[PDB]
């Protein structure tokens, strides 16, 4: 499966991809899973996590 | 819904969350969508993208 960018995006970190509207992108298989923005109830810290590292309670 | 961390994770960028195995985490609503590792066919560059910025071809 190929995706098309709907908008321009500028990278904020060393790991995200900059792209322009119209680019064709393919999903890369990755053991970490998709990444989600999460809040730790335990510590109060907040940021992105790799989905394959967690499980529902 | 709450998730539990299955492993320790150390942050690599300014935006990911470090956590220890056993922490309780909640998903933050986010306009960007989940993030996926992608390869640009157009440019050859590779990195994470916000899913809500793309659509299937």
Among residues B33, B26, B41, which one has the least CA distance to residue A54?
Answer: B26
Q: Which residues contact B43 (CB under 8 A, 6 or more apart)?
A: A19, A23
CA distance A34 to A16: 13
Across the A:B interface, residue pairs with CB atoms under 8 Å apart total: 171
State the total domains in chain B: 1
Residues of A in contact with B17 (CB under 8 A): 38, 40, 45-49
CB A13 within 8 A of CB B13: yes
Interface test with A, best of B43, B54, B56, B57 (most A CBs within 10 A): B54
> What resolution in Å is listed for this PDB structure?
1.5
- The structure was resolved experimentally with X-ray
Whether B50 and A9 have beta carbons less than 8 Å apart is answered as: yes
Report the C-alpha gap between A19 and A9 in whole angstroms: 5
**Residue A51: which domain range?**
1-57
């Amino acid at each position: 499966t190929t995706f098309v960018a709907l908008y321009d995006y500028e990278s904020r970190t060393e790991t995200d991809l900059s792209f322009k509207k119209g680019e064709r992108l393919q999903i890369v298989n990755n053991t970490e899973g998709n990444w989600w923005l999460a809040h730790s109830v335990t510590t109060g810290q907040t940021g992105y996590i790799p989905s394959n590292y967690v499980a529902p309670s």
